RNA sequence: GAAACUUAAAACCGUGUUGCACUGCAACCCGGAAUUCUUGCACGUCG
C-alpha cells in the first residue's frame, strides 16, 4: 500500500563524515515494511534442467 | 450339189431413317503427435 513511501535525499559522507545534499530526491520506501517473496527450486537431475544444489 | 445372219429393237427398274426406351451411379473427416521457449537487478559515477 502506498501509505508508506517518503521522499529521501542522496547524501555523500566521505572520510571526513561530511555529506551534502544532491539534487537527487526520489520516492523510496520507509524501514519497517515486510516484503515476501516466493523462490521455487527444481529438483530434476543435471542436463534434464535442474540443479540438486541450488 | 455348188448360192441367201431365229435376225432387228429392250436399264432388273420404281418406293423405303439401323430407328424406339436407358443418370458413369451408390458408400468414404486431409485426419493423428508437438509450450514462441532458454540466459538478463532501471543501474553506475559526486571539488
Known amino acids: ?6 521522499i529521501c535525499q542522496k547524501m555523500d559522507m566521505n ?6 545534499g544532491l539534487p537527487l530526491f526520489r520516492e523510496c520506501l520507509a524501514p519497517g ?3 515476501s517473496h516466493r523462490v ?10 535442474g540443479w540438486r544444489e541450488g
Open 40 to 49: 521455487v527450486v527444481d529438483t530434476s537431475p543435471t542436463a534434464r534442467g
Open 1 to 6: 500500500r502506498t501509505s508508506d513511501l517518503l
Open 33 to 35: 515494511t515486510s516484503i
Open 15 to 20: 572520510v571526513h563524515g561530511k555529506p551534502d
